[PDB]
Task: inverse folding
């Protein structure tokens, strides 16, 4: 049920195009009705496991239709760590 | 289409309870009709993006029903990606 | 030269005793004269490559002398990279 | 003291060259007198913490002098719970 994802996209085809495709994945993510915090290396999402897996998949499909080679680091979590940290406030 | 997923499950639970969530995730994974290689830190899967996302979600649900706190590192590689055989011929 | 480390420590210990290795790694990190931001899943450091590698090693040695099993995820970004600030508003 | 490292260099550069900076880092790594296994997403090294930190730093400096933007994922393990030595099965 309760879960957290930390997503890092890394397009490896063009130039910086790249901060474009990332920007895209970011725009898509903002579109979802999910709690999100953009940190320096990854975008942290919080919500129901089911919705995050769905959003993760879409986020990657978005990135993949902007670059031919997409690599992503993903962190998935469930309980006991932190949501307190979520405090963007910056 | 083409996609590769690397999975590492780090359950934040004691001894015996963890060797089980890990055993369970591996067994489940073997159950799928997907190309898989178990390496020292992560289990590497290869196949269609759609099926891997599905398998990833199930793998995590399996792990989550064996421990209350499950953390996972996942690597995704989508698009015109080289195969496990090709990468291994760096 | 310019570099950025993203540090995440998972102690693999039982409650109270782990959330001590983490306060230990955070405290040590604050001790260094390095730019640092604590995000939900990892602590992001920014500075000279040489100093970060040194701080990373010490941070891990600190964690290791508080738990017998320490696992860490680390992200290294070195070169004509974008500062944390620039990435902030990606 | 006893430790294990998992390295993944993502040069985020235009095709071909990306496997060149990766091959570079690989050649350097083979040069060290350290136990190593190349898996599909990361190269796993095993040995004394001190030597691995030294090798990691050099590996990255090698990669950085072949591309202007180098990103790396690194996993560090200290202990035995995850029995990384089992990597005899390569």
Result:
């Amino acid at each position: 049920m309760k879960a957290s994802i930390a997503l890092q996209v890394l397009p490896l085809v063009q130039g910086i195009d790249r901060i474009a495709v990332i920007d895209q994945v970011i725009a898509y993510l903002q579109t979802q009705e999910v709690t999100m915090v953009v940190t320096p290396f990854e975008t942290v999402l919080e919500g129901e496991f089911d919705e995050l897996m769905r959003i993760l998949k879409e986020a990657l499909e978005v990135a993949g239709q902007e670059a031919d080679n997409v690599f992503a680091n993903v962190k998935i979590n469930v309980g006991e760590i932190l949501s307190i940290d979520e405090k963007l406030e910056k």
